[PDB]
Ligand SMILES: *[C@@H]1O[C@H](CO)[C@@H](O[C@@H]2O[C@H](CO)[C@@H](O)[C@H](O)[C@H]2NC(C)=O)[C@H](O)[C@H]1NC(C)=O
């Protein structure tokens with residue numbers, strides 16, 4: 637395993653957002669041309685084992701641990717999000733769950749601040765939204781998914797999302813009901829795994845839904861806000877109620893928030 641390996645994301649110009657938004661309220665539109673300097677992205681979501689190295693080194697106590705609760709999906713114990721006492725990264729469904737059998741799955745119940753701590757510890761940083769989206773698209777222009785426009789290309793599952801009737805029944809057709817190992821499923825064109833689905837991913841940007849069509853260089857998002865941007869969707873997402881496993885999709889949370897479907901990966905200007 638090299639679950640902290642990074643890949644070089646090439647310098648380029650891309651179309652961020654879309655002129656055919658699927659969730660208009662989220663400011664997926666307008667499409668705009670964005671220039672991104674060459675940089676490095678983690679191939680994988682940060683795993684339990686990798687976060688454990690951080691905690692072992694630093695003694696870091698996550699915000700969920702200090703608060704004493706975190707959000708868990710009802711189906712693995714909105715109305716289906718319950719604040720569970722004692723749910724945190726070591727106990728993803730609450731006090732009597734464990735990570736011992738899933739060391740290579742993405743770390744969960746990490747806040748934005750927790751993610752910034754990790755990435756900086758590791759000689760890295762969070763990606764910007766624009767860097768994240770560019771990387772997600774994996775060298776393809778104006779496609780829905782990292783791999784193209786078909787959800788199951790060649791009849792194959794390419795990401796860990798939901799199959800079945802949400803929230804009652806997750807069939808586990810794609811091989812995983814909950815999270816999957818961070819190295820599951822095919823890589824995209826840049827060598828990134830689970831950039832859509834599995835765990836949601838924090839980015840560095842403050843959230844806004846108001847974007848200009850002006851061309852920008854290495855944009856950082858708005859200078860202020862109350863919520864940070866997360867991307868990519870999760871194992872919970874289904875077309876029937878969600879549809880956020882598209883590179884253009886975007887959602888938000890307050891920086892002290894944590895949940896059983898939200899993780900992160902890091903980026904860096906140069907190799908640490
Ligand atoms: C985090 O630290 C713990 C405690 O030191 C590590 O677990 C120990 O590792 C040693 C060395 O392999 C073993 O001999 C012990 O049996 C382990 N102790 C316990 C209580 O489990 C753990 O491996 C570290 N985590 C990571 C990801 O490196």
Ligand SMILES: [Ca+2]
Pocket residue numbers: 796797798799808809810811812813814871
């Ligand atoms: Ca699944």
Ligand SMILES: [Ca+2]
Pocket residue numbers: 681830831832833834835836837868869
């Ligand atoms: Ca993911």
